[PDB]
Design a protein around this ligand. Structure first.
Ligand SMILES: OC1CN(C2=Nc3ccccc3C(c3ccccc3)=N[C@@H]2c2cccs2)C1
Ligand SMILES: N[C@H](CCC(=O)O)C(=O)O
Ligand SMILES: N[C@H](CCC(=O)O)C(=O)O
Lengths: 255, 254
């Protein structure tokens, strides 16, 4: 099975890491729009067009399924992309809602959604959660986490201060935190550590990882493919420098 | 005179602000490539291609001069753009060198260049300064200042921590700091304050503002008096949502 994975840049590698572990797909065509990243700071019209242009990229590749690894593109462009695609397109938002339903029994559990400005502005998560009966949802655009993570600021005073900046105004302590952005898994332990330290919690809030949630969805849509692939072929493509993009895979994938 | 101003996004508004104050031009066409910003985190070939495409944008506008307000495009793309342009293109690097020549008599004065990653890696400032005999040049890509400033984080603990992050390893106290990025004028006083606080200075280092340096250059080159329109015709264009761009202009120009 040959698939595509689309992201604004290298963030999509956090989804790719999950995909690789699932051993579902024999061939993966990765495309990161690294000339135009970030998407999260930009507007619905721009991101929609970016999503359609991604469809054009994948045409000659004869993929069977397209994964939109980007939470921003999932929130803003997925519906438009599905309108103009014959293949299934799967984004990272809906599978996370499904993961919530499996992991969060109490409809009143406080859930906090973290994402880019565009993702949070869309209310994609809030709407889908409300539709599933969840009553206690907060959201926060933790925009600066993205550039910090791009700069490998994954610990230390600057990361702590940035987390404190965004989290300090929170009205409700979350029991569940959705990592609604490709980059956030890289600081998941730090986020857990923030809440435990600041609120004297012996264990952290439950974190939802977009890559693991999409994998859980795919593992049952393509059940015949579980553990099918001994070692996948992966092609790396970028609109920016493709060596720059591929170079980052080692870190993100823990190669 | 009708001119164009090119930037990656809204940062160019710090140059536009200088330009408007100087009353040099009757008409200004501003274009911010806000669908693709930042340029600073990307590679030379991509940035060069961005610069070439910006020329296409201005073609129907029949401008007489193109200003490249972006320090990143100036450092990486200016030479390529000039190669494909029939009109003069002026960037923000060379005018700042000329300002330093005027203002910094001591060739061994410690100069610190701040810029995006791409700008700093290009060594465009270092090379130009060495060419003019300056011997004591330091450089620092203060990359995260850009997103902080985009988010209007112009004060407080986050900014202070970020400045500390970049400035603490410095072994030479600068006499001159080049604000080698469109965004940096918006934290100029905070940068001044950091060095005075942390290095125990009665006076801050001299800060070189790219917008002010290009104004000085343009007046001399075109023999301009500060007597064009107080309120010129200004058009705003963007590759992203132009309403979003203009909304920000209102904040940066104030
Ligand atoms: O190296 C680091 C520097 N950097 C970024 N800086 C800029 C520069 C101009 C406009 C936007 C951004 C944002 C951003 C701005 C405001 C709020 C949130 C983000 N993130 C990019 C990014 C580049 C790649 C991913 S994010 C990455
Ligand atoms: N891939 C984006 C993060 C980087 C960007 O803003 O493009 C997301 O998951 O929201
Ligand atoms: N205009 C850019 C800053 C924003 C960007 O990285 O594109 C510069 O002056 O370097």
């Amino acid at each position: 099975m040959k698939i595509g994975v689309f992201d604004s840049g290298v963030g999509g590698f956090s989804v790719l890491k999950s995909l690789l572990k699932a051993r579902l797909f024999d061939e993966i065509i990765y495309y990161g729009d690294s000339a135009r990243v970030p998407y999260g700071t930009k507007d619905p019209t721009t991101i929609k067009q970016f999503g359609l242009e991604a469809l054009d990229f994948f045409k000659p590749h004869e993929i069977e399924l397209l994964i939109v690894a980007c939470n921003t593109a999932s929130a803003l462009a997925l519906e438009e992309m599905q309108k103009y695609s014959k293949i299934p397109i799967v984004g990272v938002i809906e599978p996370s809602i499904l993961a919530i339903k499996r992991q969060v029994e109490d409809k009143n559990a406080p859930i906090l959604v973290l994402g880019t400005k565009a993702t949070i502005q869309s209310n994609a998560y809030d709407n889908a959660l409300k539709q599933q009966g969840y009553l206690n949802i907060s959201h926060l655009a933790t925009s600066l986490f993205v550039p910090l993570i791009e700069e490998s600021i994954l610990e230390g005073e600057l990361l702590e201060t940035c987390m404190h900046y965004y989290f300090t105004p929170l009205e409700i302590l979350p029991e569940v935190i959705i990592l609604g952005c490709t980059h956030f898994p890289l600081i998941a332990q730090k986020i857990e550590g923030y809440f435990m330290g600041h609120f004297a919690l012996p264990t952290p809030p439950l974190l939802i990882h977009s890559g693991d949630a999409i994998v859980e969805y795919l593992q049952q849509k393509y059940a015949l493919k579980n553990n099918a692939c001994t070692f996948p072929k992966v092609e790396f493509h970028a609109s920016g420098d493709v060596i720059w993009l591929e170079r980052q895979a080692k870190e993100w994938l823990k190669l």
